[PDB]
Structures are given as structure tokens and as C-alpha cells.
Amino acid sequence: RLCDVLQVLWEEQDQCLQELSREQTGDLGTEQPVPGCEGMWDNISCWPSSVPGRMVEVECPRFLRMLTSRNGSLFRNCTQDGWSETFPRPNLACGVNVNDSSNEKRHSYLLKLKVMYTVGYSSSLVMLLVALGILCAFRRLHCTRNYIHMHLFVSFILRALSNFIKDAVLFSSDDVTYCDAHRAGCKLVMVLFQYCIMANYSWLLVEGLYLHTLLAISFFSERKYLQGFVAFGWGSPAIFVALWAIARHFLEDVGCWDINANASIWWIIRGPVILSILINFILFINILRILMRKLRTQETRGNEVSHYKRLARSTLLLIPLFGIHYIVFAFSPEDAMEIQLFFELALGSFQGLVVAVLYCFLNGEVQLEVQKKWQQWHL
């Protein structure tokens, strides 16, 4: 940990600052292996100032002391006549010297994906704000299919907004903003980011649940359970994020909450999201079997080709609205994190735009209501 180590070095420097008033001046003249002149608390991890000065005990920082194979064995002597200073690269050099070239490409790959996701979220946000307005503006469009759609669009806007705020708070600069400044603020934005992502997953599942109830449950059009579906969409992520936050504060409370060091704590967010993806996949398949049953008992004998085009068009429309693409990399090995991050974030960021175009811009009713109003302007 950069901060824990930096502090250890600052603590070792405060340990040095405790012995700073050595009062050994005047023996620096007589030749000695070390006269206690060592004052590079910054240059060395800290200066031992021991008169024999056979070795520097601190060597690498105490946090990295366990990592470093050797302990001490390096003597730094500020002597006109005496032992000669030994530098870390000459002595051990820890492992920092190791180029550590591996994972540099991954560091670059993530930065490129961030730009790709930034444009996917931006495009989605612009088209979803112009879709939420069209639906809200026209009373004729208002229906419980639209109101469910409205909340989905908002969940995408929060997912897209959360990411931009998170990137600014954590990745805006190479210097660590929020290093000790506003830690509770960096943690609070992380909590909002986690909730906004989970809210979009919850709303994708609610879209599947509503359509599945409309078809599977006979005469299920009460319009009364709409508040229950709305409560599940926002409330269920809030419970999971809160349990993750409790654990993150109670255990694994290291720096900002960005890094998921503890796998078990991550499963409080990852497991519910994976379950939502599995459930939406099954409802999506059941809705398609119900639909084909309607296709097969119609057109009379009909045409295999004609039925398949109806099936293919309806399946393609459902995939963006349920997030069925999340199934492909769910349960994938951690070796395909690069492809999964690319498929889910670089191309996935555009799923808010695709949903808006299919269920608003290309929705026949929306096209009719926008046309009729434009005719009045056209008159």
C-alpha cells in the first residue's frame, strides 16, 4: 500500500527526527567509519547514526522489509575518511529495480477502454435524456409499460453519471486526489457508484418480471403491483450496497473502497448481480416459448421461415431490454477479464442508447404522436 509504506517511511523519518538533535558534532573531523553525521532521513529510509555504522538497520521500508530478501547489510557513511556509502541499487535494491514491465500493457488497455466506455455512456445519456422527455411530454404515451421504461432509462442515466463522477474523483490526476483528503467523500462516491450500477441491473430484471407476469400470469393487469416493482428496482440494490458498505467499513477498511481485495465482501455485490442476470435469462427464454406458441397457433399451417423472422426480430428486441448479453461473460474465468471488460463496458456502455432507440425512437406509437404534434407545427 503506497500510503501505509509512505507513512512507515514518514514514521521512520519522525524516528530519525527524534534523534535529529544527536549532538555528535565535532567528531565528524577525526576519521571514523561513521561519525553520526548521517542526516539523509529522506535519502536513506532513515539514518541510523550508529558510531560503528557497520550496516543501516532500516534498509528498505518496514512494510517492504518482509518482502525484501535481506535485512540491512548496507552501510551508508558520510565520511571524508571511513567506510563508503552503499546505495540500494548496489545493495539488494529491493525489487523496485526489477523493471516490472509485465502488466504495463494492461494499464494502457484499461485507459483505452475508459475512453470507449466514456463515449458509450455519453451517447446513451444524450439519447436517454431526449427519450425520457418524449415519453413524459405526451400524455397519450403514458401507460404502465412506459412508466416501467421511464425508471429503466433513469437507472441508465445514473449508471452513466456515476461512472463520470467516479472517474473524476479517483482517476482525474496522477497525484492521488482523495489520498487522505475527503476519504469519506471518496468512499461516499464509491457507495453511489455501486448503488447506481446495481440499480440498472435491478431495473433490467424488473423489465423481465413485468413482461413475464403480463404473459405467464392469467389476467395479471392489476397495475397495483407497479409500486412493488418500483420498490424492488430501487430498494433491493440499496440493501446489497449497504451490506457491502458495512463490511467495507467494519472489515477490509483500507484507503478508499475502490479496490476489492476481499473476494467474499465483493460477492455481496457480484452475487446478487449475477443472480439477476440468471433470472432474466430464464424469463427471456420462457417469454420466447410463450411467443412461439402464439406464432405456431396462427397463420394456420403458416411458413417456418415467416415464424422464424418473427421469432428472430422479437428475440433481438428483448436482448437490450433485459441485458441478456451479461450472460455471455457471467461465470467466465479470470483469464477472460480483458475480453469481458471490453464486451461488458466498451460495447455495453451503448446499451442505454439501443434501449432508447428501440422502445422510443422506433416505437410505432411514439412515431405517431411526434408526427401528429409536428403536423400542428407544420400546418
Binding site: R1, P88, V96, H107, Y117, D174, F193, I259, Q340, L341
Partner: peptide, 27 residues
């Protein structure tokens, strides 16, 4: 989810870079 995994991976790397620069400063 991918967004959390992406944020964990880029934070861990940035830190391993911010620690490597610090060691480059000290040594």
C-alpha cells in the same frame, strides 16, 4: 460487475505505479 472490476483493476495498477515512482524517487 465489470464496472467494479474495471475500477478495482485500474486503481490497483495506478497504485503499483504510484509506489514504483516513489521507490524510483527514494533509490
Amino acid at each position: 460487475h465489470s464496472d467494479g472490476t474495471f475500477t478495482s483493476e485500474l486503481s490497483r495498477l495506478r497504485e503499483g505505479a504510484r509506489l514504483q515512482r516513489l521507490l524510483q524517487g527514494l533509490v
